[PDB]
Amino acid sequence: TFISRFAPDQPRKGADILVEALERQGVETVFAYPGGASMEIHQALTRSSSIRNVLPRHEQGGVFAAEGYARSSGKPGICIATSGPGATNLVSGLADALLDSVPLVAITGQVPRRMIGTDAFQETPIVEVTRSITKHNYLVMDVEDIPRIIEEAFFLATSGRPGPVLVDVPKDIQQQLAIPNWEQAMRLPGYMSRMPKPPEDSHLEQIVRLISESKKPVLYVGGGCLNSSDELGRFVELTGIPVASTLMGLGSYPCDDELSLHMLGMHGTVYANYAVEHSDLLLAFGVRFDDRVTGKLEAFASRAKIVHIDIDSAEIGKNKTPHVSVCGDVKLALQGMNKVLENRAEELKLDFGVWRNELNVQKQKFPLSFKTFGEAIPPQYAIKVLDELTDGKAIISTGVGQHQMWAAQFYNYKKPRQWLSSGGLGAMGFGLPAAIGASVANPDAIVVDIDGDGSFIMNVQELATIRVENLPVKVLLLNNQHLGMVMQLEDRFYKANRAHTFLGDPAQEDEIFPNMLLFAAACGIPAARVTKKADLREAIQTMLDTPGPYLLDVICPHQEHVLPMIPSGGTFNDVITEGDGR
Amino acid sequence: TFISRFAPDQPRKGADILVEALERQGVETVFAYPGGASMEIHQALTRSSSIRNVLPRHEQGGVFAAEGYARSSGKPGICIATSGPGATNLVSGLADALLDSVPLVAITGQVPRRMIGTDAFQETPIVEVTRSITKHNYLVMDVEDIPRIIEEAFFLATSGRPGPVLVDVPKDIQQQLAIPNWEQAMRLPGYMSRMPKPPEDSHLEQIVRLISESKKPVLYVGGGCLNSSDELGRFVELTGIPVASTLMGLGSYPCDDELSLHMLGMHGTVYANYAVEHSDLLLAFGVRFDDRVTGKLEAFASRAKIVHIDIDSAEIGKNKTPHVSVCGDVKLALQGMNKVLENRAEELKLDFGVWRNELNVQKQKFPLSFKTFGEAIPPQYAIKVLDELTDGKAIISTGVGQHQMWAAQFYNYKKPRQWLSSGGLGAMGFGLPAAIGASVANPDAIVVDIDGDGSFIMNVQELATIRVENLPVKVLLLNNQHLGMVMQLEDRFYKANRAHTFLGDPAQEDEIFPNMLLFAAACGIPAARVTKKADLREAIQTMLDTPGPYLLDVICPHQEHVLPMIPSGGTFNDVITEGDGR
Ligand SMILES: Cc1cc2nc3c(=O)[nH]c(=O)nc-3n(C[C@H](O)[C@H](O)[C@H](O)COP(=O)(O)OP(=O)(O)OC[C@H]3O[C@@H](n4cnc5c(N)ncnc54)[C@H](O)[C@@H]3O)c2cc1C
Ligand SMILES: Cc1cc2nc3c(=O)[nH]c(=O)nc-3n(C[C@H](O)[C@H](O)[C@H](O)COP(=O)(O)OP(=O)(O)OC[C@H]3O[C@@H](n4cnc5c(N)ncnc54)[C@H](O)[C@@H]3O)c2cc1C
Ligand SMILES: Cc1ncc(C[n+]2csc(CCOP(=O)(O)OP(=O)(O)O)c2C)c(N)n1
Ligand SMILES: Cc1ncc(C[n+]2csc(CCOP(=O)(O)OP(=O)(O)O)c2C)c(N)n1
Ligand SMILES: [Mg+2]
Ligand SMILES: [Mg+2]
């Protein structure tokens, strides 16, 4: 029973209907940047006693904060912007939320309805621009459609395969007085008709049947299992199948477990890729068969029977045609298969110890390794220290690059929604704002941003947002003074010819530039810089123990390479296991 | 006779054809940020001995730098980015270059042709996204189309009404070897068929005829006259008609002249708006009748015969239907009308001294005024000092807000392409990167960024670009600690109820936050902060005299309001002339 701030017979502004529509959706936090087209919304936002607004310093930071808010909680992330340049600054976040399937709802202001199409002031057709980078978008043409469109937006953004939904609201609609109807149904007939039904018991038995007939099975877990942590953990108990996770599925199955193969793919471990290559049964639960995981599709699981489970019927048979397919919630498919495995425990043999001890041979032969040069800080080792000092219980957001892979390789995430990273779009500067939204969604959680010097500076303006909002965001900056991941491809395929990848000052090469500590100092954030490996443990411990925000400039040798590596479009027999830029 | 770096019978990479296509267009500077999809281009960029690359710290800064490069020189601005997040970061600049008609060419990398549509890694349909915010865009599907598409891109971006043109280049096309054909014609039949012919002598005489018959004529000059500085200066000699410029036409006719009415519109001077309201002939040369200039269209020049000259036939009669219309280059229309006025000098009376001395009455009755409170720095006065200390010969780029209007009101720009500001889209954070491109295009010019604390922080990362590239960019920061322009609308129409407009730290209200000096310090840039009006003249003089970059944190009282003001959709009888937030 919701309690409104207005009488049921009292006319109110359209912006008041919009804010109340958010309150009725359970929204507690929004990331709104004001402007002329959304000032009525920002005015009605102050009249709400339940919706907190985190004012960013850039709308790209606002939408990225809404992603980290969403990614670290499962709730939908809500960002608000004004028309024109405010909306165009959300584009990177919307395309990012789409490719990673993040529940997000973006509300942009717009010129009055009478002015749409005249190339007016701050007038851009944001609906036409964001049509291919959003799950769905709207353009409110009447104040009475506000409750229905907002309900459809949150339903579309959260149900099925989640994604971003944009709601363009003209200025005159925000000002028009009306009495909202909260009981009008949603106009989504063909969407709901396509919502997958619970999986049939016939499909689940044949999958369980194929498990007992298989000798070398591999679990291909991805971002679709973030809500099935317990269901997947029980499923491996009854089967004993090794688990290979994606960049997005990290945390679904604990990386520190003996059955874990960690990450597979281009930068995935050798033993995980070996398991998929030489498997006879591939259980692809909650994945989309990205090119960064398969490489040449004909070589991916070429000797394996593929079982694909998805909530998006478009992903099934999209890149790799499976044997058996199940269109539905993998959380339910695991629940059904679990009670089939325990009731048929005696019937089914289920002892793949020959197969996993074949993989454990590769696990000790080709493990995740890193060199330590003198006292220079290995970035891999620095992240391994953060794992130890936080007991693997810290929410980790990252940028995109070498530091992004090392944060995925050398951290043992125990639970899902702990690993926040742009994997689909791979957007730099995602780290710092995502940690902002994650800290707001989880106030009592250790939130650490493992960013790179190139990614960190892109949205460095959000350091002011961290201090103003008093958020205990930790910034573990892995400063390599380079556009590292691009530099690595230059060393491998372009004879180490630098093409605009150095980020420091060429007039002073051996001086670390920029001095990121002064960036934190400008925003009243305590900062420190560590260079030698001995001082690394205390420095990270100081960052964690110091209350509030903290930036740690961890200096790393730039010649490091992310290993192992499979070149774009290769097979398992093309994995690069050694080598750097020295 | 161009000199290629390759034999005419030698196959070369597609990226080498692309760079050579830029060299053949006279490109001397590009603003490129590397990525996996554009690494081949960045590799071929290093092999060029004539194209300098300014590496930004954010692609939004790269495209804004290309705008300032273009806006301050008339040459086309070229920015390059990678696929996915690199391209989505150009969106704000492309929509900005479209609404302000800035010649710009954007080159984005893309996944190989065989992968377009699979929602691949860093794969977004940038052509579909940017179709409504670009003059035109391309998707290269064969390496042999590179010379033709690049030639069509630069021709479309510069000819007619200029605008942005995007060229999406897949990765496999950059790698494909070929021998380019530089002599293939452009496939633009219906574009060139619509290119306006030189204006007929019949139209120009009737315009000159209407000038002698008119008693109260007003010149409505805009961004279309930036290339007609001399032609417009001679036209007013032969007619004596007062000149009212737009936010975009600033500098076309010197603001310090006795016939100048300065800016008209929402925040335009009272005497300029009075001239248009009580005119009988309105010469609208190079304008588009924006809502920020006309307000209620029925009241705009309601008693005036409207003569509209444009190179875009779509703008003629778009918002305000004119009497006489001329579709063509205003530079030629002025040349034709000039030689008609001097050959008919004796026939035509041409003495509007009764009308301009009627306007000079309003010029002294309601001039541009500002209060000076104690020793607090008036932002208007600070800009007036910069005009004096630079002799009005400094290239000025600004953000968007209160400081943007005061930089337009209280600076006497003597020549066009000296005033760089986002007027159409009104994009914040445009100031600092635009000054970067302007300084590269005009190395020996005084480049000053009159930015606001909200706009400056959005693209503050480009301070590293200024130091690395050793550009003498001056930053005159008008720090009001608020989202000023939005705060002003709160004081006027929302009873001064603050809705997320304060940018400092609420835990320490009287402390200036953030300390922007440490931002400059982090990037090795000398900085200073002035608070008292007496120290203002020496501080600005120190900024100018100090070689290289320099940031001046000018603190201003936030209660200041931009005056005069006409509310959105009003008439001339609705102008607000006094009032602030005190
Ligand atoms: C520099 C860089 C390197 C990278 N290299 C790698 C790498 O080596 N290895 C790697 O794995 N990734 C890598 N990526 C990331 C890669 O591009 C993809 O993000 C990754 O493949 C994601 O795979 P995913 O399908 O598990 O994630 P997602 O895209 O999040 O998975 C979405 C899928 O889950 C389904 N789904 C969602 N909910 C449900 C449900 N309830 N029931 C059933 N299905 C559901 C969706 O329908 C969809 O099919 C890299 C990224 C970057 C930036
Ligand atoms: C906060 C804010 C406040 C603003 N308030 C004002 C204000 O008070 N006053 C004001 O003037 N602006 C104001 N603006 C800016 C406003 O939105 C527009 O940018 C402004 O009206 C531009 O008018 P313009 O047509 O002269 O500029 P432009 O858009 O640059 O003019 C383009 C026109 O010139 C034509 N053209 C180009 N080349 C030629 C040629 N060779 N021959 C003939 N025609 C040509 C084009 O076809 C087109 O019609 C404000 C902006 C902001 C951000
Ligand atoms: C906005 C954006 N631009 C470009 C890219 C392409 N890119 C991917 S990784 C990388 C280099 C980033 O280096 P850094 O952020 O410093 O992390 P590092 O690899 O050095 O550890 C780039 C440019 C991207 N993913 N996003
Ligand atoms: C990216 C973007 N977001 C929002 C707006 C709307 N807007 C226009 S002016 C302004 C306030 C800017 O204040 P500031 O940059 O500090 O300049 P000031 O008015 O304070 O002098 C805003 C938010 C915009 N033009 N661009
Ligand atoms: Mg780095
Ligand atoms: Mg300001």
Beta bridge partners of A419: A396
Both tokens assigned to B365: 């009755």
Question: Which 3 state secondary structure label does DSSP give A76?
Answer: coil
Q: B129: phi > 0 → left, psi -120 to 50 → alpha, else beta; which?
A: alpha
- My answer on whether omega of the bond before B56 falls inside 30° of 0, hence cis, is no
If we measure between CA atoms, which residue out of B39, B4, B38 comes closest to residue B22?
A: B4
Both tokens assigned to A211: 């498990």
Say yes or no: B319 contacts chain A, CB-CB below 8 A.
yes
Question: Which 3 state secondary structure label does DSSP give A165?
Answer: strand
> Which atom of ligand 2 sits closest to the CA of residue B266?
8
Which string of DSSP letters, residue by residue, matches A336-365? HHHHHHHHTTTT-----HHHHHHHHHHHHH
Beta bridge partners of A473: A447
How far B357 CA lies from chain A's nearest CA (Å)?
34
Experimental method of this PDB entry: X-ray
Place of tokens 């509007």: B352
Report in angstroms the alpha-carbon separations of B201 from B160, B208, B229: 21, 11, 22
Active site (annotated) includes residue B485: yes
CA of B246 to the centre of ligand 6 (A): 23
CA of A262 to the centre of ligand 2 (A): 57
Tell me if B74 sits within 8 A of B417, measured CB to CB: yes
Site from B64, B82, B89, B498 to mutate, A interface, most A CB atoms within 10 angstroms: B89
Which string of DSSP letters, residue by residue, matches A176-244? --B---TTPPP--HHHHHTSPPPPPHHHHHHHHHHHHH-SSEEEEE-GGGTT-HHHHHHHHHHH---EE
Expressed in angstroms, the distance from the first to the final Cα of chain B is: 66
The kind and range of the H/E element at A433 are: helix A431-441
The kind and range of the H/E element at A60 are: helix A59-71
Report in angstroms the alpha-carbon separations of A571 from A96, A301, A305, A578, B118: 28, 10, 18, 17, 20
Asked if residue B248 has its Cβ within 6 Å of ligand 2, the reply is: yes
DSSP 8-class letter at B571: -
| CA atoms within 13 A of residue A516's CA, in its CB half-sphere | 31
Site from A29, A47, A92 to mutate, B interface, most B CB atoms within 10 angstroms: A92
Site from B13, B43, B91 to mutate, A interface, most A CB atoms within 10 angstroms: B91
Active site (annotated) includes residue B122: yes
Alpha-carbon distance of B288 to B247, in angstroms, equals: 12
Q: Ligand 3 site: residues with CB under 6 angstroms? A: A 399-403, 426-428, 452-455, 478, 480, 482-486; B 33-35, 82, 85-86, 89
Question: Which 3 state secondary structure label does DSSP give B217?
Answer: strand
Say yes or no: A17 contacts chain B, CB-CB below 8 A.
no
Alpha-carbon distance of A455 to B79, in angstroms, equals: 19
User: H helices of B430-524, where?
Assistant: 431-441, 453-458, 463-468, 484-493, 516-522
How far A519 CA lies from chain B's nearest CA (Å)?
6
Sorted by where each starts, the structural domains of chain A and their CATH numbers stand as 14-193 (3.40.50.970), 201-365 (3.40.50.1220), 379-562 (3.40.50.970)
Instruction: Give the E-state strand segments of B35-123 in sequence order.
Output: 52-53, 77-81, 104-110
CA of A205 to the centre of ligand 2 (A): 68
Which string of DSSP letters, residue by residue, matches A491-502? HHHSTT--SS-B
Tell me if A453 sits within 8 A of A479, measured CB to CB: yes
Asked if residue B309 has its Cβ within 6 Å of ligand 2, the reply is: yes
Both tokens assigned to A162: 């989640």
Active site (annotated) includes residue B456: no
Give the count of beta carbons closer than 10 Å to the beta carbon of residue B239: 22
Give the count of beta carbons closer than 10 Å to the beta carbon of residue A69: 31
CA of A453 to the centre of ligand 3 (A): 9
Alpha-carbon distance of B416 to A580, in angstroms, equals: 52
Q: A549: phi > 0 → left, psi -120 to 50 → alpha, else beta; which?
A: beta
CA of A485 to the centre of ligand 5 (A): 8
CA angle B431/B432/B435 to nearest 5° reads 85
Beta bridge partners of A212: none
B-chain residues near A319 (CB < 8 A): 118
Which residues lie below 8 Å from residue A576, measured CB to CB, with a gap of 6+? A492, A563, A564, A565, A566, A567
Q: Whose CA is nearest to atom 22 of ligand 3?
A: B35
Alpha-carbon distance of A273 to A267, in angstroms, equals: 10
In angstroms, this model's resolution equals: 3.2
Question: Which 3 state secondary structure label does DSSP give B411?
Answer: coil
Say yes or no: A116 contacts chain B, CB-CB below 8 A.
no
Alpha-carbon distance of B196 to B210, in angstroms, equals: 23
Asked if the Cβ–Cβ distance from A425 to B486 is below 8 Å, we say no
Residues bordering ligand 6, an ion, CB closer than 5 Å: B 452-454, 480, 484
B-chain residues near A428 (CB < 8 A): 85
B-chain residues near A81 (CB < 8 A): none
